[PDB]
């Protein structure tokens, strides 16, 4: 505690009442003339000290601080996701026992926890300064904890996997029985406990409590941000460059989550406060992107997106981020295109890959890198993590910064043809957690092209027969992608006899323009309902108001459904019957059309104003503010 060493690399005299040896060292460093005064041994010792201090980012004292450059740079293959290089390093013959420590960490980061445990045990055998020995003991306890937790989770969880043989589990349970991580440091040689006191925190259950409690400075509303970010970078560099497995634990991931989330929230708060006062901050780089991808869950990224305006956060080092994402895509392909699936590695890697591809929305990607990422996401991402709807969401997010090129459209077309091929089987049905299916990919393609015709799906449709029903009702949702001949061939497999067939045809996109016979069918259903008076009524009213129906013989059925009367003739509607919740069921197009009617606009404006005043409902408020309905 003789000096503070600040995160920017400036030293400050703190608690030493003797000679200012740090100031003298810096004075020696700045000017070479007094360096010759040292002896030869003292000269080489000073050279080693200077190399250490410049490698650890210690430049000078605070009083002599000038243009301070604080750029994060982690020398770790594990941090950068260089899995192929890590595998090559493990394959090589380790010259030193320090190379074995790196090898054991790389094995841990690749999911090979049994090999990592064996290597750590071997290093402990061959390591009795004793600094690698203590670190190997720490990391072996950490990997034993990881193996135990993974075994528990695999017992709890979609297919029963046994990555660790029960003989290995029993062996490590017996080896690490009654093993005290707390007693480890105290049992070290008394010289180690003096020279390497700073390592004792690696034996603690928690080591980021201080860094987490200092995160409250980001919640103040009255630099702290730079201090927090540089402290996070310091922790990451220490835990990765020194190959410490606690970097993979939930405590460190939660700490990174909390720090990054609070930094982004604080920057957003400063931006809004400035806008309030000045009336018109956090700049993300490659390392921030990798930290968010590795340590954030998708729910955490969603909380970040709803809380703050990430689109207002500009992204730097986008070539580095694109290289990271392309490496993630390549590893996804290697893990799943081939039989290289490592379940232990998969569990940790799939969350990072998901988060990286989710956060890639804010990154401008080159056409080739976008092609690699899109192909890996569509084809080689396992369905247990990213189903059809989730994978569509991930893909469509990539169009925010990269409007769909022709190559990506071809990849999505290949995906669509593969999905159609999967529908040869009658048992196959797409499972979506988002309600988004293969029709949405074709909708996106037609949105970004408006003239794209997929030749292979047209060929599939022209080959279709009446037997394989699944293919027809699959390709009917992909109707705009087909050619004229394919459209004509497909349209022969469905009938529009009764009104239910008409509703099915509208819903699946079979027919987009209302023929007079469809209008007559609608009127027949309406007459039947009117006769039997003493779900589709609202739909027909909305279609009439949306100018989808120009039959003009619907006003006969005014007085049964309040929504139908509201939509057929807004001018004559009684608005005490209006239900505000109706506005919560309409989409952008319908709400905008209601806003521009010049009728019913003031009634629904008053309804929305009453709803906002009475309930402070955010949905009603945003409906009233966006379209001014």
């Amino acid at each position: 505690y003789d000096y503070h060493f600040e995160v920017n690399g400036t030293v400050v005299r703190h608690k030493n009442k003797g000679f200012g040896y740090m100031e003298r060292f810096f004075e020696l460093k700045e000017s070479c003339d007094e360096r010759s005064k040292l002896s030869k041994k003292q000269y080489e010792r000073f050279n080693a000290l200077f190399n250490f201090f410049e490698k650890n980012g210690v430049i000078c004292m605070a009083k002599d601080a000038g243009t301070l450059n604080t750029s994060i740079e982690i020398n770790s293959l594990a941090y950068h996701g260089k899995y192929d290089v890590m595998k090559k390093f493990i394959e090589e013959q380790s010259v030193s026992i320090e190379d074995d420590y790196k090898k054991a960490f790389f094995l841990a980061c690749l999911g090979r926890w049994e090999e990592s445990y064996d290597l750590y045990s071997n290093i402990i055998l061959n390591s009795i300064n004793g600094c690698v020995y203590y670190l190997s003991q720490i990391n072996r306890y950490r990997i034993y904890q990881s193996i135990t937790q993974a075994v528990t989770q695999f017992n709890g969880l979609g297919r029963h996997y046994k990555p660790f043989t029960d003989e290995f589990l029993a062996r490590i349970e017996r080896e690490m029985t009654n093993f005290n991580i707390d007693d480890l440091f105290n049992g070290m040689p008394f010289e180690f406990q003096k020279k390497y006191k700073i390592l004792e925190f690696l034996s603690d259950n928690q080591f980021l409590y201080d860094d987490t409690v200092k995160l409250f400075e980001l919640t103040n509303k009255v630099s702290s941000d730079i201090v927090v970010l540089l402290r996070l970078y310091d922790n990451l560099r220490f835990l990765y460059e020194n190959c410490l497995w606690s970097v993979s634990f939930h405590e460190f991931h939660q700490y990174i989550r909390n720090s990054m989330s609070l930094l982004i929230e604080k920057a957003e708060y400063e931006r809004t406060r400035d806008i309030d006062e000045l009336g018109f901050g956090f700049f993300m780089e490659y390392y921030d992107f990798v930290n968010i991808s590795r340590h954030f869950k998708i729910d955490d990224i969603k909380n970040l997106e709803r809380s703050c305006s990430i689109d207002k956060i500009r992204f730097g080092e986008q070539e580095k981020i694109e290289e990271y994402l392309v490496g993630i895509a390549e590893e996804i392909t290697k893990q799943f295109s081939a039989n290289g699936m490592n379940v232990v590695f998969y569990t940790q890697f799939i969350s990072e890959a998901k988060a990286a591809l989710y956060f890639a929305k804010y990154v401008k990607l080159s056409e080739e890198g976008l092609g690699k990422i899109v192909k890996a996401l569509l084809f080689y991402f396992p369905e247990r993590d990213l189903d059809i709807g989730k994978r569509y969401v991930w893909l469509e997010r990539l169009t925010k910064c990269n409007e769909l090129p022709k190559s990506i459209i071809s990849i999505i077309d290949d995906f669509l043809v593969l999905q159609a091929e999967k529908h040869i089987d009658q048992n196959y049905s797409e499972v979506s957690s988002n309600g988004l299916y293969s029709r949405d990919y074709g909708a996106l393609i037609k949105h970004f092209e408006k003239n794209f015709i997929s030749k292979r799906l047209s060929e599939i449709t022209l080959c279709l027969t009446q037997d394989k029903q699944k293919q027809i009702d699959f390709l009917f949702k992909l109707l705009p992608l087909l050619s004229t001949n394919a459209k004509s061939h497909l349209l022969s497999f469905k009938s529009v006899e009764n009104i239910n067939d008409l509703m099915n045809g509208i819903r699946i996109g079979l027919i987009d323009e209302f023929t007079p016979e469809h209008e007559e069918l609608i009127i027949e259903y309406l007459e039947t309902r009117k006769v039997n008076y003493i779900d589709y009524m609202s739909t027909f009213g909305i279609w009439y108001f949306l100018e989808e129906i120009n039959n003009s013989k619907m006003e006969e059925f005014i007085g049964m459904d309040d929504q139908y009367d509201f939509f057929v003739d807004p001018e004559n509607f009684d608005y005490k019957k209006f239900i505000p919740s109706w506005l919560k069921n309409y989409n952008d197009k319908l709400l905008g059309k209601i806003a521009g009617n010049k009728h019913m606009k003031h009634h629904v404006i008053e309804v929305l104003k009453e709803r906002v005043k009475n309930s402070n409902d955010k949905r009603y408020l945003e409906i009233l503010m966006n379209y001014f309905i």
Binding site: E305, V393, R397, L436, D512, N585, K589
Partner: protein, 116 residues
């Protein structure tokens, strides 16, 4: 009704319950629920008006609605606590006045959209 959540963006209730219902064609379904997906930025056609898309799942597999889905709930059962909750379901359905007032889970597709 301790895990019952009222989602107000679309005025529905998320409740972990199953429904035994009958349509207007006497067809019977058992242990069926609904899932709502709020998609304001969905790429609509000319005839799409709803802001949410709803999928019906019976026995863990979704249904393809080819007929009219006018239905009446005959028995609603809470999975976590097997106590019958049918009366509460009808009460909420009468109060809510929206299609499918009680839904197994609501998926919000707004925050994950590129246009959010």
């Amino acid at each position: 009704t301790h895990d019952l959540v009222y989602h107000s963006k679309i005025n529905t209730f998320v409740w972990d319950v199953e429904f035994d219902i009958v349509l207007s064609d006497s067809k019977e379904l058992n242990k069926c629920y609904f899932v709502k997906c709020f998609n304001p930025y969905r790429i609509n056609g000319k005839c799409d008006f709803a802001v949410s898309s709803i999928d019906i799942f019976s026995e863990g597999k979704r249904l393809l609605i080819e007929n009219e889905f006018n239905f009446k709930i005959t028995k609603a059962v809470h999975v976590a606590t097997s106590k019958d909750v049918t009366e509460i379901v009808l009460h909420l359905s009468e109060r809510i006045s929206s299609p499918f007032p009680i839904v197994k889970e609501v998926v919000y597709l707004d925050w994950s959209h590129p246009q959010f």
